């Protein structure tokens, strides 16, 4: 009963529940950071829907979300941009393509998101259940500084392993390395997630409410 301890259906429910004049600027960076701020409000309610997250001590939830929020949002907007051709779809419903990202100076990290994340997710046809599980793996990171009882966090992450793999072997029986290929997207997610944080901090030289506090 690997799905009895970490059900992939409730993880998918956590993902589904999180899905006049033009007063919107056009500088792509401000549009990207604005959408990131209002998705941080979305991610908090997502994490509490992930099984056993709110059962951890309150500060452990604070550290876990403040540790992987960048990876957690990069994951679900790149997976949101599967059908987008050479671009990403922000949570505000606005799109950002390559040239508008190139002229903004972020084309380097943009092309890596496009080729190492969304292109990998699309050509493998990653479904929302697998995306939610990979996010639950990123959330349950025992390496985050200050966690009391990191083994409790490591145990929850390992539970997602067993249930995600059980899901991959059940619904994708002809792809035995499917569970592994899903996990192998996390190296590209961690690296771009930190390269996005250096882009973010180098930009504080427009502001948002929740985003500025997540960068304290």
């Amino acid at each position: 009963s690997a799905n009895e301890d970490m059900p992939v259906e409730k993880i998918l429910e956590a993902e589904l529940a999180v899905e006049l004049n033009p007063s919107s600027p056009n500088d792509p960076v401000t549009n990207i950071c604005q959408a990131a701020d209002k998705q941080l409000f979305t991610l908090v309610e997502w994490a509490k829907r992930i099984p056993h997250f709110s059962e951890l001590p309150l500060d452990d939830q604070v550290i876990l979300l403040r540790a992987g929020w960048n990876e957690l949002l990069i994951a679900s907007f790149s997976h949101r941009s599967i059908a987008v051709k050479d671009g990403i779809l922000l949570a505000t419903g606005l799109h950002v393509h390559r040239n508008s990202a190139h002229s903004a100076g972020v084309g380097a990290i943009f092309d890596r998101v496009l080729t190492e994340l969304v292109s990998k997710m699309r050509d493998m046809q990653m479904d929302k259940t697998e995306l939610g599980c990979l996010r639950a793996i990123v959330l349950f990171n025992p390496d985050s500084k200050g966690l009391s009882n990191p083994a409790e966090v490591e145990a929850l992450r390992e539970k997602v392993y067993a249930s995600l793999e059980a899901y991959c072997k059940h619904k994708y029986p002809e792809q035995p390395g499917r569970f592994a290929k899903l996990l192998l997207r996390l190296p590209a997610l961690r690296s771009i997630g930190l390269k996005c944080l250096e882009h973010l901090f180098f930009f504080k030289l427009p502001i948002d409410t929740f985003l500025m506090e997540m960068l304290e």
Partner: peptide, 7 residues
């Protein structure tokens, strides 16, 4: 604030 959105 992150600490308030959690009840």
């Amino acid at each position: 604030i992150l600490h308030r959105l959690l009840q």
